[PDB]
């Protein structure tokens, strides 16, 4: 029931993801070193990690079938609002339920709740973020489903500032229908049970995390002394 077009969409998104996500973590050495001891000792490092990841997200989004037909303004709006959400999704790959941390290849680059706290965040964000990573892990998504969910996240019509909401929606709907059909034809039960609805709930969860993250970000970037330790790309995309 998966058309040639739908199978093409999946192969494109899979390749786009393979070309833009590095599970070897080879670049983490390029980042300002992580500091654990502490007034925001982990902010420079994780700011760099995020800035690096924003660049990966942009590269993925450009390869989403249809994305490039939007106004420059609308591509920008969708990436600005989605970037943190997609990075949270992306990060599930290094998240381990063994100890509820993001484990990126080594000890220096294994991040837990206290590291995220040392980046300026409170439990208001960190607790639901962990709960999110756990719930997402528990879905045990196919990689096919993972990349579709990321693409659907980016092309949402209700994003703030969206101009051509009509065109954004048609782009998304084609992806949504690809995902729904994929699960039916390709995800065997019981894992498939309500899987689509569950995945959309993770996008609602992401909207909520986006909102809290923005609050804590404005509070963090309120003092220029902290704003100083971010990167130019982070300041541009998350605001300042």
């Amino acid at each position: 029931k998966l058309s040639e077009e739908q199978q093409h969409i999946i192969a494109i998104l899979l390749d786009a993801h393979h070309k833009t996500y590095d599970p070897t973590y080879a670049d983490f050495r390029d980042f300002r070193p992580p500091v654990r001891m502490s007034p925001l000792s982990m902010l420079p490092h994780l700011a760099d990690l995020v800035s690096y990841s924003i660049q990966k997200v942009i590269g993925f989004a450009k390869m989403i079938p249809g994305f490039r037909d939007l106004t420059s303004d609308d591509q920008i709006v969708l990436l600005k609002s989605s970037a943190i959400e997609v990075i949270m999704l992306l990060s599930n790959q290094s998240f381990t339920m063994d100890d509820m941390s993001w484990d990126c290849g080594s000890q220096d680059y294994k991040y837990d709740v206290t590291d995220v706290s040392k980046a300026g965040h409170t439990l208001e964000l960190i607790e639901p973020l962990i709960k999110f990573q756990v719930g997402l892990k528990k879905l045990n998504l196919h990689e096919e489903e993972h990349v579709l969910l990321m693409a659907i996240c980016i092309v949402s019509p209700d994003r703030p500032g969206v101009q051509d909401a009509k065109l954004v929606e048609a782009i998304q709907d084609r992806l949504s229908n690809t995902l729904q059909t994929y699960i039916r034809c390709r995800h065997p039960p019981p894992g498939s049970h309500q899987l689509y609805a569950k995945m959309i709930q993770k996008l609602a969860d992401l909207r909520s995390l986006n909102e809290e993250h923005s609050k804590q970000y404005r509070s963090l970037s309120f003092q220029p002394e902290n704003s100083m330790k971010l990167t130019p790309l982070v300041l541009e995309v998350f605001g300042n």
């Binding site: 942009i58 590269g59 303004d73 920008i76 600005k80 130019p232 790309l233 541009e236 995309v237």
Partner: peptide
């Protein structure tokens, strides 16, 4: 619009 780096990365 006043996102130089974002726009350049998207081109």
């Amino acid at each position: 619009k006043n996102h130089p780096m974002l726009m350049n990365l998207l081109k």
